Structures are given as C-alpha cells and as structure tokens.
Assembly symmetry: D2
Homo-oligomer: 344 residues x 4
C-alpha cells in the first residue's frame, strides 16, 4: 500500500455553482464590486488620493454581528467618501500554527465539527448581503479553491504574510479579479512582497477547480493592481523612514510605490490600543507629505479586545480589535488628515 495511508476521509464538497445558483450576485452587488475594484485600482496607481481603509473584525465568527457592524460602518463610509474609501474586513479564518478555531468556512458552528459546505454557504450569503447594503468587502484568500465560491463578491484581497512568498499564492493573485495586497514577511522582509507584485502582474498557469468543481488548468492574465502592505517585522515598519525606504525599493523594482500600512499585528506589537497610535503617526505623515501612502488596515469590531470563546456578542475570538468608539475616533482622524493632503 502507498496511496492515502494518512487520510482519514474524503468528503463530499458542493461545487461553486451550487452556491452561485442559490445566491446569485445581484445587479447592485456587481456594480458595487466593479467600481470599488476600479476605485482601488486608481488608488494603487496614484490616480486618486483617497485613503483605502480596510477595516473590520480580525475574523468573522458571527454573521449577525458582522451585519450590524456593517450597518454602522456604512454611515462612516458615506460620510467620509471624499477622503476615505472604506471597505469592510470580512476574513473568515486567521491562519494559526497551533490548534484552536479554524475559521467560519471550516468550522461555521464554532464547535470543532467541520461543515465546510455550510461554511461556504454562510460566507457567500454574508458577502452578498453586505454588498447588497452598499458595503464592499475584502478578505484573505488562503487556498486555491475557496475563491471560486465568493471572489466575485470581493473588492480587495490580501495574501497574508505567511504566503506572500508562496508561488501558488502569487499565481492565484495573478488571476484574481480584485486588486490584491501582499504583506511583508512575518520577520519584516519587504522584498518578498515586492517580488510577489512582480510575479502576480504576469500571466501564470495554475491548477484549480472549475465553477463546476472539476480540476482544471487556469491560465491567468496577470494582476496589474497589486501592492505592498507594511504590517511590521521584528520591529514596526509604519513610520515615514520605513515608508520612504519601501517606496525607493518599489520604484527600484519598477512597481507601484503606493503602499498600505497595517495599524495592527506586528505594527501594534499585538496591542490593539496601539492601532490608534499608528493611525496618529500615519495622520502625521499625511499632513507633512505621505504621498506614498494609499491605504491603511485596522482591526475593529463592535466591542473591544478579544475572548477565547464566543460568549460576548460583537467581540473578536481571534486578534484583539478596537471597539466601535475608538473606530469612530480613528476614522475621523484619518479623514481629517487626508482631506489636507488632498487639498495640497
């Protein structure tokens, strides 16, 4: 015996078309996705000076809270639309080296069953509702298969720090319909993210699944709307001198020198109250010059901090988020600052 020795089971997976038939994209959702992708493209290439704000929970573990959060964020989206382009974080799984909760797609029931068919349906339904209420959505694509279930509803995608250097993730990015952000590496390596944009911009052949759930060869056209995200290393890398050094390197590689700064993760050193400090520093850069900044990322929820079990409503069970109060503060700060950049 040499085949599937360490496989316990192979289970039935509904193909993407099953979900697309139940939850077809609406006219409005298409329009919103389409133009949000264009609008972000314009930010990536320096054609517009608004600040892309990718903001929301670290992960989504409860769609009801996600929709209530979206309702609130939507008012600030409209209010700040001339200064900020606000797009909600709708991430289904925090990649984790240890055991623990495996994300909404994997474990929608939050009990260690794996009900991926239900997860993908829930994921798509939440995304469709969000787009339907005027809130565009962003997410991190972890594998090569899940995107076929809801990428059509995504206006901006991330490739995480742990996969920016992975070739098949760069290939995936090269065929994604949405702009894509590549994070610097977990120890602060920027070059891998710069290379990724290089790779992602060219055509690739990668193996994936058709909408019908059958393996196929996908020939991509390249993604011209990729960029770097500074999310910290051994040290934080959000300040002006890091930004400026990043911008030089980007120009040096012939790619866009407009980048995004993540206020969270290793830039806050995992202390959610520091996100505001980073946003303050970014505010200060925009007021002085900050021409290379095109966006920021913030981990924000209804209620602040985090919990191991999903006991409190609207409170993260992955990374600790700022609460809604602080969120209003932060967005007002960034709006006020960028208005003054856009006048200059």
């Amino acid at each position: 015996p040499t085949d599937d020795i360490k496989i316990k089971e192979v289970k039935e997976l509904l193909p993407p078309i099953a979900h697309l038939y139940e939850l077809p994209i609406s006219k409005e959702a298409s329009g919103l996705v389409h133009r949000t992708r264009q609008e972000i493209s314009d930010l990536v290439h320096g054609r517009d000076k608004r600040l892309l704000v990718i903001i929301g929970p670290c992960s989504i573990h409860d769609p009801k809270a996600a929709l209530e959060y979206a309702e609130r964020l939507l008012k600030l989206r409209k209010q700040y639309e001339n200064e900020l382009l606000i797009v909600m974080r709708v991430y289904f799984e925090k990649p984790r080296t240890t055991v623990g909760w495996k994300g909404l797609i994997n474990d929608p029931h939050l009990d260690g069953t794996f009900d991926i068919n239900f997860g993908l349906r829930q994921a798509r339904s939440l995304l469709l509702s969000l787009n339907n209420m005027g809130m565009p959505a962003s997410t991190e694509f972890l594998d090569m298969i899940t995107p076929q279930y809801y990428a059509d509803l995504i206006s901006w995608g991330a490739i995480g720090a742990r996969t920016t250097e992975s070739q098949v993730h760069r290939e995936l990015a090269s065929g994604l319909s949405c702009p894509v952000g590549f994070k610097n590496g977990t120890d602060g390596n920027l070059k891998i993210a710069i290379d990724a944009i290089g790779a992602a911009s060219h055509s690739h052949h990668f193996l994936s699944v058709t909408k019908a759930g059958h393996s196929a060869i996908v020939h991509t056209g390249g993604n011209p709307d990729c960029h770097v995200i500074l999310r910290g290393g051994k040290e934080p890398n959000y300040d002006a001198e890091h930004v400026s050094e990043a911008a030089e390197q980007l120009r040096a590689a012939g790619v866009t020198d407009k980048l995004m700064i993540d206020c969270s993760h290793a830039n806050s050193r995992k202390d959610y109250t520091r996100q505001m400090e980073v946003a303050q520093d970014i505010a200060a850069q925009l007021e002085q010059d900050g021409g290379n900044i095109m966006g920021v990322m913030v981990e924000s929820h209804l209620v602040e901090g985090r919990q191991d079990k999903p006991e409190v409503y609207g409170k993260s069970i992955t990374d600790a988020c700022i609460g809604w109060g602080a969120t209003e503060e932060l967005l007002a700060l960034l709006a006020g600052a960028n208005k003054k950049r856009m006048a200059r």
Copy 2:
C-alpha cells in the same frame, strides 16, 4: 468573475494517469519500505544517513534515468551507511520569469502542456522505482500530488512555503515522510511549527483521484523533520546543529534533522557543497547524533546552463558533476561507518 483569466483548460484527472501507468508490485514494495526506513531514521531507530541527491530539477528524463543507473550502484554499495534516494524535483520556484519546470513545460519551449508533463513525471518516477531507485520530490501545490505521490518516498516543503498553512495541511496528509526547510532568511521556528502542525489532523480542500473537488480529512504526519538550508548566513555547522536540536527537543518534536549542502548553505556556489559535506563528515566523527540526512544538488555534469544544450547539466541551480558526487558520497559513507560503530 474571471476578468483576469485568459483561459481555463482541460485537465486529465489522476485516474487517467494511474490507469496507463499503474504502480507495480516492485515499485509499491520499494516505496513502502523506503518510507519505513526513512521513518526509522527520523525517529532515531536507525543511524544510517539519508541522502537526498540528484539534479536541482529534472528537465530530461533520459539523463535522469542514466544518472539513476549510476546512482543506484552507489546506493547499493553504501546501503549499510547511507540510504540514498534520488532528487526528482520537477521545478525550482522562481520569483522572476524563466523555465517553469517539467510538469508545466515538458517541451522546454514555453508552451504549457501540463497533461504531458504530469504523464512524463509519473512515467519517470515509475521507471525509477522499477529499477530500484526510490524518489523524492517537492510538492508545490495541493493538486499535483494526486498524480504521483504514490511513487514518492520522501517529500519536501520548500523554504518559501514552510510557513504556509495549506502546505502544512498538505503535509499532514502525505503518505511519505516530509522535510520542512527553514525560511529563506534563516528562520527555523517556522519549520519547527510546521512539523507540529503537520503531525495533527487537518481538513483541506483538494481534488479526488477522479479530478473532483473534495474535503480531505487527514490523519496527521508523524514522520516530519526540519532541513537546515542556511539563511542570511549558513547554518550547517555543529553549533547551529546543536542549537537546532535544542529547539526541536524544546518543542517536543524529533531532534533528528537534515542538512542541505546546497542553496544558501553553499552561498549558491556549487563548489562549496563539498565544504559543507566535509564539515558534516567531521561532525559525524566527533558526535553528530542529531544528523539524520543530507541534501546534495548533483548531476552527470557540473555547473549550470541557461538553455538545455549540454546533456546531463542542470538548467536551474548549479550542480556538482558525477565525479564530485563519487567523492562526496564516499566521504559521507566513510564518516558514517564510524558513527554506526561507536
């Protein structure tokens, strides 16, 4: 939807390949026991040295089979000291443009003919196992393994994907032992982490033998280990080995590890592989109980070329030639004969 997709193309499922090239009794037996033998090495139940040795990449099956036929003689000759398993990597991952590997580009001309490539890959691997040479490879994605993992005795996850969750989940379901390299700037924690993760059950999305998407529930891979392949500085010496083994034991994982003689440890100079090997040989005489394997980039002919003009010469990373391989292998054999006595 699919705005940046040029084309979606027909892909034969693994069963089409498995139907034309079914694994043989002899190939199954060889894979089965080479896996056991390597498992014994990983867990410190046998003190032979695993040697993953062969071309950086396979671009010409004829040369590969030739190389194997010479490598087989040495495998048999050193069977008490070394467990020799040929490197049969089909692609070297590259940030920039260039040849994309045998699976992607079997014709070496920039056409993609993945169906032909997967067939060639499986046929080469089956022939190699049939003649008595087991095979090792790097699994880059979650689909290609279904086409030939049954013919593979040891697997690598590359430096670039050791931190990737889905690659760890893949390793958790791989029938073969798996080596995780430290990161391209020398980070070892990510490989230790990767071993921990890979030893547990996971649910990942992939494709059945029949080419249909499915949820695969894995049992966990107990036969994982790390590979020291250098970082900003090389990490092959006795001090690095010792500090690595302390870290591995601290994490509750096997402290038996493999050392790559090429790539960052040689400073990307193929000549230096022998210096690393010498250093490893010297550790084996003094103590070196934490070393279970070495990795060597080797071919019929030394160095490298941009186009496949010269027979048996790598077109990816530069390799030592057949000579320097007879030397490196003797050198490792001699040194480990001593280990296994004392």
Copy 3:
C-alpha cells in the same frame, strides 16, 4: 471536423447533491416512501389484497394545483385505506412524437424556454411537499439521469410503453429503489413487458451519473417488485379475458401474475369519460373473482377534460382527465368492489 457537429450548446447542469442539499428528504417523507414501497411490494407479490390506485393528473404543469389536488386526494386515501392503497400520479412530462409543451422538468415556465435546473428543483420541491403532507408519489422515469434528482421521493415508478422494450430502461428499472410497472407496447404487445420484468429482476451494469454529477458504472442488484400494466393496444385489453390471458403468460414466464390495469390512454380510446366504464368493468371482475388484479391507473384532475394552453386552473394540458366529482365516484366504486373481494379470503 467530426465531433459535436450537430450540437448547438452544452449547458451547466447542477448535480443532484445541489438539490438534495437544499431539499433534503425529511424523516416523515422517508418513512412514507419506505412504507408505501413495502405496501406496494406486498400487492405485487399477493400478500395483501388492497388495490393500488395510481391516480392524478396526466402531467403536472402547476405545483399549486398539484398540491390542492393532493389535499383532496389525501382525504380519500385515508377513507379507503383498508380497501385501496392510493398513490398520486406526479408525472412531469407526457412523451410525444410531435412538438408542443415538453413537461415541467424541461419547461417549468411553460413558455418554450428550457430551464431544467429550475425544473428539477421544482419537481423535487413538489415531491417533498406531497410526501410531507402524507401523499405518496409515483412517476414515469424517462431517462437515466433525472432519477438521481428525486427517486428518493418516489414510491412507485413507471416505464412507459415506448421504453418498456428499451434495454437501458430495463437496466434502470433493475436499480430503482421503488416497485416499477412496465406497460405493454403501443400496439398491445404484452411480451415486451413480461420480458422487461424478467430483465429488471436481474443484476445489470449500466452507465449513469453519481449524486455528484460524475459518470460512473452502476452495478445494480435487481428489482424484485416489478409488474406489468395493461394499457391497451390496437384493441383495449382491460377485460377479464385479456386479464386471464395476461396472467397465464406471466405464470408461464415464472414472474408475478398480479398486474395493473390502466383505465386511460388506449384502454379508454383517449376519451376520458370511458375511464369510468373501465373501472366499472374492473369492479365487476373484482366482484366475480379478479385475483390477478393488484392495481389500477386513472388520469384525474380537479377539473375535467384538457386544454391546449394552461388557462383553466387544475385542468390537464396533456391527456384529458376525469374531474373531481367523477374521481370520488370512481374511487367509491373501486373501494366498494374491492371490499367484497377482500372479504372472500
């Protein structure tokens, strides 16, 4: 060029699992399907002397109407449950040589568009509701692929006169979880139906599709609960003499000699009123002896007759049916007659 020369398009087909996931079979529907299949088997093999009545529209073109019909039929199902085993006709298409409306699965919108995905979803939705309210369902399986979408909701199946002689339909029958009736051929050939019962009782290997929509080899175990249906020919064949001759031939092939009589189609000469005459003759055979009769088939709707376009609620757009009044009478007539046959045990 040699491939797909005369093919206009190949279109996306959701696999059975997609429908099974949205409309899983309920506990109650399962129990009812299970039990009804058993109860029918007992009739096929002469363990119970109730009369199976397959009754309802010639074809379903309107689920609302079908449900309302079921609600009324249900009361009579219960009322006569000791004499009659009443199962509703839920046929989606009447196969036709000519052009016209192609059934609910093919043309659920009744406008000449094709929307088979919607059709299959509607068909299963209706079948699940019917079973849930207590009404078991029967249908004609026309191809090898549609049964995966809803066979689990079907308590009795028919293979039509046009396909009884088809080997692939016999093979299909040999793997269907429900009893199956085979009709004599459109000119009155009975041998093909007897042959079909023989064939369907054995194991076969045919090619079909898994629940997941992938082609596969199905090894079937054989269907022991098949029987013939007398549906007329060049002449009608519902009378005692035809029944008696049909039973002789059945015993002679070593298959069950309990058969079903279709009161409609070529036994009524397509003139729906005459169904009552056939039932009357069936009642009269039951009173005398009628040991070989285990079921009847009747084409019945809320409103009698037929129409070309679906303008009048609850009226067939395929073969003309008797309306509700006559349905009550036909059922009372059959119940009364069969009560007397069961008493003579």
Copy 4:
C-alpha cells in the same frame, strides 16, 4: 430522515474514466477525420438522393474479437475499393446485441468474455479498433444503445443505428438529433414502420437532453437536429423487404414530408433469423434495382469470416450473437448487389 430510500437496490457504483482519457491516448488522426467527414457527406448524399450508389452496412452481428475484426476489414476493404462506383461499403462494428435473455453483454460491457465487467477496458478497446479501422481506410458504423458511450467514439463513426427496440424511445431520438453522423431508425420488432417515420421527424428537430461532457460531468446538451436520418426496413411478424412493402413505405415517408429513401436489412426478421436467407433478400433487392427501385438507398448484411454462430468464442471469426453468412457468400452477395446497382445508375 432515518428510514432508507436511496440506492436500496444498488450493489456498487464504480469508477469510470471519462471520454477525454480515451481521446488523449487515442486522438483521432487527420486520415480518420477525413474519412469520417467525407463518408458522412457521401451518406447524406444517398439519404437525400443526390447520389444513387447503394450504402452497404456489412459486418459481424457483434464484435467480440478485434483481431478477427481487423482481418475482416482488410478483406472487406478490397471489395469496398473494387465496388466504390456502385456501392458505398461501411463496416458493421457493433459492440453489443441488446438481449432480453442473460448471456454475453457485448465488448464494451464484457471485453474479457467472462462475465467480469471491465467497461473501461471495453471502451478503450472499442475506440482502438474504430481508430485502427478508420486509419486503414474502412469507415465504421455502430448502434448507439445508451446516452453515454457515444462520447467515447462517435467521432469515429460514419453511420449510426437506432435499434428496433429503441426507435420509439424519446431519449434515443433526442440522441440521434445531436449525433454528428447520419442515422438509420429500424422499424419496430413486430413491423411497426410509423415509429421509425416519427423518429426521423423528431430527430430532425432540436432537442435538450441530459448526458455527459467529454470530461465525464453531467450536462444539458442542446442539439441542432439531424437532417440525415432515414428508416430501415428489418421485418416484423412478416418480412418487409419486397417491392410492395418498399413502395408502401415510400408513400408513408413522402406523406410525412421526410426522405423516401430507405435502407433494407437483409438479416434479422427479414431473413426469419436464418442467415442463409440473407442472400434471398439481397436477390429480391437486386431484382428491384433492375426494375426501378429508386427508393432504396442502402442494405444491411450480417457477415463474418466464417458462417453461422456459436455459444462460446471457440472458433475464430465466427459470430457469438446472430448467425452471419461466411466470407464466400459475402463476395457473392456484394457482386450481386454491385452488378444490379450498376444498371440502375446507368438508366439515369
């Protein structure tokens, strides 16, 4: 949903390689494509009366041994070339006789003739044989029994049959509507011709039927319709090959506004299931061609290397299904038909 209702009477569902796996190993060649393409057009011409050659669908009742088949084709090929101005000879390459009785289920189903079922091997063997035949210059004809097997080798078929037992089946008519080759519908097993006339009707229109893609996934196939369909007279209770039956069939066909050019099966019910009588039928057809017989566009003959039949595949090139005429009788029968038709063609 605790009570069981699903796959109660299924023993097993097994793996089936999709058409593309066979098409990859055995792609159609330029020569085979050319031959299929033109043989179909040539047959279309006969169906629509633009050419007065006679289509001759001739060969074993069923193929149980590809080596014998190839040897048979080599022999038939010399007569195909020799009579090419009078006859259009196409080989019968039928894999499986439909049977009510248990017994051998054909080469696709049971390629090892031992009651195993190795349909993957069977389909590979069927395709290989059909490709070998087209590559040597012998076009091939077959009967399509199910909706799935055609995807494996219809690209190598120049003419298709719908059998007597399925001519009335709606799905088979829909299948015919999307088949790339001309198609003949047989009359029913008791002699009903109207079903075959209806079938031509139906097959000529567009349909939607459910089948499998080349990749093995179920799909909806929207067909264009098949304009190259015709009827086959194969007898009933009584034989139906003579001039009066022919003439009565032609009036019915015209009356239905379909082609009044038909094919006559010399075997099966027209021969009373007696292989020797095939020559009788051909003799009668020859007599019709000399008189007038304008409505006849083809004939069907069950022919093999060796005459008769056997239950076990003991003797080489001898049928295990319906009894066939041997090779001697075949040369006779074809010379007979050639000579007769040469005279018809000269009168116009």
